[model samples]
Target: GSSGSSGFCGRARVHTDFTPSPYDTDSLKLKKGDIIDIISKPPMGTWMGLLNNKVGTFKFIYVDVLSSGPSSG
Candidate 1:
């Protein structure tokens, strides 16, 4: 089966800090109060984002969506 537009994409505020394991270089190290530009969210409970010119993965539960639409900037 095919799926469509099932996740959030926009800006979000980090509410919880997340530290990825040392071996997980693909994940983003997040801290509270950080704002992230969400690129997309996968069904696996993680979201793709861009921060400080770095693109990586982070858990969706750590952030609160600030905008549900395209990022203004």
Candidate 2:
């Protein structure tokens, strides 16, 4: 199930590198230009995601909802 069928799975491009908050797991450090494909709507200002192939929670200041297009160059 995607995000436990939480209706929030999509690719999110990091607008800023994030440091895990106290409520967040330490493994959620995302560098700039990192794009993550697992997701939730960032409840409590935090996002549920996978880090190093491990699931963890992290924080976000802002997010832009984006949609995917057909893959073709």
Candidate 3:
């Protein structure tokens, strides 16, 4: 399975030439297990051009492991 072309920053320390088997760019529907971050969102594109002008990386993996499941009875 291929991660991403850039594979610049992901949870898995591996990358291939093929795009992520199931990559996603929509917040509404994220991948099953993906690791991504906002390196720098310029205030000129995407994000509705409302760049927060902030900078910093989040040292955490994004696998949606916490928000997937039911509760006890």
Candidate 4:
């Protein structure tokens, strides 16, 4: 069980080749096997991303929460 802030919690999809577009400079770029955790979500639409020891916001669409059994480390 985890107590948290934003309702959003997920990982960067496996097999996703993300690139920075001019309109999305804040998005996180990732390799196919990369996995990152989301930490927060601002009402402004950008979610705070935790990856590679660097913190930033990735595209909202890339964040996915799966309804599995409760609890994680």
Q: Model 1 has how many clashing residue pairs? A: 0
On TM-score, the leading prediction is 1
What is the alpha-carbon lDDT for the whole of candidate 4? 0.62
lDDT of 3: 0.29
Off by over 4 Å in 2: 1-8, 21-27, 42-45, 68-73
Q: Give the candidate number with the greatest lDDT.
A: 1
Q: Write the per-residue lDDT of candidate 2 for residues 1-58, one digit (tens) a residue.
A: 3466444477666677767677755557777776665656544556776656666654
Q: Which parts of model 4 have CA positions greater than 4 angstroms off? A: 1-15, 21-26, 69-73
| Ranking, lDDT, top scorer first | 1, 4, 2, 3
Winner by TM-score between candidate 4 and candidate 3 = 4
The residue pairs found clashing in candidate 4 are none
Better of 1 and 2 by TM-score: 1
| TM-score, cand. 2 vs. native | 0.50
In the range 1-73, model 3's lDDT, one tens digit per residue, is 5475542222221121223224442222223343333344344543211112322222223222133338764
Model 4 compared with the native: what TM-score? 0.52
| Global CA lDDT computed for model 2 | 0.61
lDDT of 1 at 37: 78
